[PDB]
Design a protein around this ligand. Sequence first.
Ligand code: MG
Ligand code: MG
Ligand code: MG
Ligand code: MG
Ligand code: MG
Ligand code: MG
Ligand code: MG
Ligand code: MG
Ligand code: MG
Ligand code: MG
Ligand code: MG
Ligand code: MG
Ligand code: MG
Ligand code: MG
Ligand code: MG
Ligand code: MG
Ligand code: MG
Ligand code: MG
Ligand code: MG
Ligand code: MG
Lengths: 190, 139, 201, 175, 109, 252
Amino acid sequence: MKTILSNQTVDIPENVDITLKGRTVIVKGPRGTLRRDFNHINVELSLLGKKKKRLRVDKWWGNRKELATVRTICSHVQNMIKGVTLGFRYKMRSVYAHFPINVVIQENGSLVEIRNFLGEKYIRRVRMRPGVACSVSQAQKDELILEGNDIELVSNSAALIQQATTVKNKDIRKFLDGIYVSEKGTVQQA
Amino acid sequence: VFRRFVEVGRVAYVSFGPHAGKLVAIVDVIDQNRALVDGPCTQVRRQAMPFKCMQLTDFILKFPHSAHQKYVRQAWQKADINTKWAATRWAKKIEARERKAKMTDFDRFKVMKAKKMRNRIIKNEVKKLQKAALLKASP
Amino acid sequence: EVQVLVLDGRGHLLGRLAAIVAKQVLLGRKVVVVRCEGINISGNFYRNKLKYLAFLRKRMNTNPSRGPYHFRAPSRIFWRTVRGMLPHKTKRGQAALDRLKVFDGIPPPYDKKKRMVVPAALKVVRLKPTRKFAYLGRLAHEVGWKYQAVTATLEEKRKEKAKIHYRKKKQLMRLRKQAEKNVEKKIDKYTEVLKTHGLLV
Amino acid sequence: KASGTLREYKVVGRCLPTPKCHTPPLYRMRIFAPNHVVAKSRFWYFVSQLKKMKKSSGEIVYCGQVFEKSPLRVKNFGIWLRYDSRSGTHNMYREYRDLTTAGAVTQCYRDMGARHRARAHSIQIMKVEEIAASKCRRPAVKQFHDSKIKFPLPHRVLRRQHKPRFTTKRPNTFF
Amino acid sequence: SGRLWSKAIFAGYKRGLRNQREHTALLKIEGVYARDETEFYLGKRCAYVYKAKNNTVTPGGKPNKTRVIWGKVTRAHGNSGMVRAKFRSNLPAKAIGHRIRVMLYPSRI
Amino acid sequence: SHRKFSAPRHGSLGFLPRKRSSRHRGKVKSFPKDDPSKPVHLTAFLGYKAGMTHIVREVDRPGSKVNKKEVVEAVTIVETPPMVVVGIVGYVETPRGLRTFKTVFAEHISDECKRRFYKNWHKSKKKAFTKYCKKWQDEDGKKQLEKDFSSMKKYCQVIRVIAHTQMRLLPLRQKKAHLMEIQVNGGTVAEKLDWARERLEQQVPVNQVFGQDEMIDVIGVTKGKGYKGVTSRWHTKKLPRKTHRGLRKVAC
RNA sequence: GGAUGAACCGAACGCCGGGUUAAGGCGCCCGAUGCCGACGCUCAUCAGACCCCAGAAAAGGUGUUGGUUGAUAUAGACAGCA
RNA sequence: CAUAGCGACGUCGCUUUUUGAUCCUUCGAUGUCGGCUCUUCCUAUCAUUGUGAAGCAGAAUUCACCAAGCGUUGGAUUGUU
RNA sequence: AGCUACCAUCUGUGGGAUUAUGACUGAACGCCUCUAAGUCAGAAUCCCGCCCAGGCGGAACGAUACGGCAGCGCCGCGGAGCCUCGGUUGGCCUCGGAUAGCCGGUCCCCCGCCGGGGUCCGGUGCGGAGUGCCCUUCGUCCUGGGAAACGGGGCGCGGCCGGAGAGGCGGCCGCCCCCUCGCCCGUCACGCACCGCACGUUCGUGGGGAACCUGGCGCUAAACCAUUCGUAGACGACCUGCU
Ligand SMILES: [Mg+2]
Ligand SMILES: [Mg+2]
Ligand SMILES: [Mg+2]
Ligand SMILES: [Mg+2]
Ligand SMILES: [Mg+2]
Ligand SMILES: [Mg+2]
Ligand SMILES: [Mg+2]
Ligand SMILES: [Mg+2]
Ligand SMILES: [Mg+2]
Ligand SMILES: [Mg+2]
Ligand SMILES: [Mg+2]
Ligand SMILES: [Mg+2]
Ligand SMILES: [Mg+2]
Ligand SMILES: [Mg+2]
Ligand SMILES: [Mg+2]
Ligand SMILES: [Mg+2]
Ligand SMILES: [Mg+2]
Ligand SMILES: [Mg+2]
Ligand SMILES: [Mg+2]
Ligand SMILES: [Mg+2]
């Protein structure tokens, strides 16, 4: 069976505009600009709203494998709209048993230094993705705040920090040390 | 993106098959590969036809699906397509292709004489314009 | 034909292109293939890389110097594929192979010459859009080719000189179209003859 | 059995007259075969499984091709059958859209061979019947029941790949 | 003042996979790639022209090193426009992939 | 059947063509990967193995037993007279690799340097570069040379200098100079060309090439030993005395 | 013809020309599909490619497709949000 | 505590590093055990690189995956494997 | 002295795609999910480097033959030829590219008079189209009309530029000499009209090898043996030396 059409329409807020070039989406909002292409997916992109900016994606004659990509793009566009208007803020908590984790933020929040994870003298230097700003919060005792436009880059940057602080040759169930992501919040809370 | 859609009343062009080079109209669609096709004014009775020998044109007719040939014939006659089709670039390109193919040896000779003279005058004018545009000396 | 046929390998399938060319060179037609790094192979990149790595392992255990000479240049990889499709162990096959020349990028013997393309061996038409393919240039680079970097910079130079040549040709074409407007009173007689006989719609 | 372009055959046959039943009852079957030779062969094969008949013990009184009543009307066919898989016999109900009854059975033979690797000698059609759109159950058929149906042809693959075999301009697909 | 003959390529002899009938040969006329196009070239005359070391006669001309082998097209081979040809003497195998002229002498039009 | 006890194989497989070296000088085969940030410097130099001796020095390796102690270390004395640059070669980066774009030599080639081109300096009339050097003074040749320089300045990617060692300073019986291409690193192609131009017909001391307490690599040809048995060529295990056909061989 | 093979498929044999087939084939080697072939299925980080035949099982898959049975759903399914 | 680790009763395979079964090649002869030397290959991985699981607190240990690149000894006894 | 021993001393290396595996975003399945599309980290694995040899594989550069007739090269397409090897029978002098999109053109902005952005105009079964384009060959004599007359043609001179990935190629100036010829439609006749016959028509002054004459510009060398050396070595080969 090949479905004739599996469309899905997203809604663009008026404060942000979208310009389409082929299958490349350009999102221009208050918090910055985001570009992401979708040439790897054979879809038709249409802009319905000259008045309220409805964006429609269409797939013609697709099988069950490729109708899943239709909403996959739609979620990506919603993430782009979310980023350019609210931004993604990730909170990571450093947990430890006896050796307190020491975190030093380098220039512009683009580089993070982890000093005394599990009490070993090795110094971990994890480099964030461009456009992602990390910082030590003043809100709590152990919190790292990662703010950036793209959820792709921010969550990837946070996961790099978490995977770096990985216990080895020990019972990971008992040894609970490591920096873990707590919540996936936003900025400006609008 | 797309502008030409397979739909009831769409006028298609028969590239190949037993009815190649004719205009047809779609009555209904079947099995995502064929359709009910009936062009009455182009001398094509109603029959199934695959989409691989269909090229979508820019003309869509207004009649209900699975209508009889009488309604389609009136829909083809009223708001006629024959005059509209022959005025398009697409038809005359096909028309020019036909007369080029059947151009005779003497007709080939006359064109070559015509092509020889026309190219020389135009190339002379281009040379005239080239030196005309050669009078440029500006900081 | 009697002239030298030149084919651009960009967006072409390896086996599909080689079969058509191998028939041509047996017919006494000189064929030159440029930009062999642009040849695409069906199947995803990792599987294609595994195929060549198995090919690498095939060597004479007694003396690898006499073993299968594993070529790493994209031109040579396409060249070896055509050799398989030809009776290279014969005098006719060697003569057929000598009528074939392969190149990476576009050398100055063919940079100023228009390149033909085989529709029947094109990636865009002989491969379904959702299927995975690999680039011979990237595959050659990851298996041992040492000139992917220089080729890209050299090809960057050629595109720039081609664009300037192209834009000059546009200006001539733009000049011609306006020129045809000026010579209109004395040209319509010959133009109408072409209208009657198909040419110049 | 082989295939091709199947035709519908109305086959009427009965037992030979014997001095117990002077006129044994007549039986009618619809056989889809490439030609009437196969249709008469399959008719004896079918009456044998149902009645206690034989080709030598009976005769066929009529064998005529069945012309479709409305070959210019689009209609949905519901086809009931039985067939032998590699590990058992299964009944099936498949729906296809076609102009003629014979075409629909032809589609079913192609579909069963493609989807279940069933050869024609194992497929055993038992009833073909035209049904209304609202009674159709296959979503593949139901997507065509649209009075305002509209779709484009997105990716027109080039078919004249060897005319010309060599050229200078890459083909276009958008139309 | 003109080519006056159709270009053809001596592809090879008519053959099976493991057998070779050298008395007849297969040709490929340039621009002819379909079986229905070959109808014009059925019955036409084809010749193979080569050169040699010794001088030979020339009908109505000075002796030269030009030699020629005569033949004609009998039927079309396959669907792709290839044709069969019978010559007075079987074509030497060194002529494979070389020009064969189509003389148009038995013109049916 | 497998061998009873697995042992490491004899002899490296990274030097398998165990043949006489086709050269006597020993070619560089790899120059340092040039970067434009560093200033202009040279990379290679030629020396002659005079011999060996040993020294006594203080060790500054903390945590070691010889820290702040006295040790002896064998050292090698290699005579390195200053070189003389006589030519410049620039290379162009082809898709097939590298090829010699153009070579420019200098005037006043030393007599010992000219001996390299002659297999028989005695019977020769010493004719090399006699007509080539005549272009260094005429109107046409100097005009031609500048075009070669600018062409090398706009096309080549790496330039190299040819230098010969002054054999007259050395006490060897050999009077024939040794020529070697030396890559010029550290800068733009234009700047290194200008520097190579200013060092033509000049003497390059080793101090301008190397420095104190730095690590370098040595390229050369080992001592010839002639035909040798497998026991010495590959350091295989000897066979016992009871062997019939001899014991300095390989059994299987 | 089955790449190759005493038995398999076809077909048995004086020397030749023409035409037509069998079994099998028609991307290249290599003769033939350089048909605008038809319908679908299938992505394999050891795919698959034809009697003999030259290599695989039981058992699993929420990969995908078809079909059977049963059930729920505008007297509102299912899922998410207390 | 079925499945951390084991798998009775049953059941389907794989390997040709054993011993069987057969006698197709060799009887106008292919040198028959074992040891020494020496090279290569395989993985059903003993150790080493990187991982998952454990009734993995650490340490020690077991199972499993990618994996054959490197390494896998010196001796008494016996011709011995 | 030479050879020589973990029996003494020295030295032994960087990168990439990635497996297993751990993850990101995210559907399928308005939930979840490492996976379907798309991303990340990742190794004694693999490959490359470093190192070893260097193709019936290329590059650049030098010097290129006597003091006596003595060879040779370059320039002449200079002439007359001899022998051999054969193919061929108009050219295209070029964008990048995508295919669920393109192509061309135009107005405003910034990029140093031209590119690239955005409005606009057109085309899209490609017609500013390789199913295409250009040249197109019987030749001359009267003979008019249109095209031109800022024109063409010089194996005619000197100069300039571009092209280096294999540039061996392309373009442009200034001077001199020819025709006012060639392009099309017309007028006017002529040519061996060789009496039906094939290899005709082209590249083409084809390529290669001697060799005669003929002008100018020219150059006057190495290799190998023998000998010597021993950084080398079975012999060869290799490193060397010789008013
Ligand atoms: Mg532990
Ligand atoms: Mg072992
Ligand atoms: Mg003995
Ligand atoms: Mg056979
Ligand atoms: Mg077989
Ligand atoms: Mg026969
Ligand atoms: Mg075959
Ligand atoms: Mg063929
Ligand atoms: Mg026996
Ligand atoms: Mg014997
Ligand atoms: Mg013996
Ligand atoms: Mg033996
Ligand atoms: Mg394993
Ligand atoms: Mg090894
Ligand atoms: Mg002992
Ligand atoms: Mg003892
Ligand atoms: Mg030692
Ligand atoms: Mg979610
Ligand atoms: Mg994974
Ligand atoms: Mg990575």
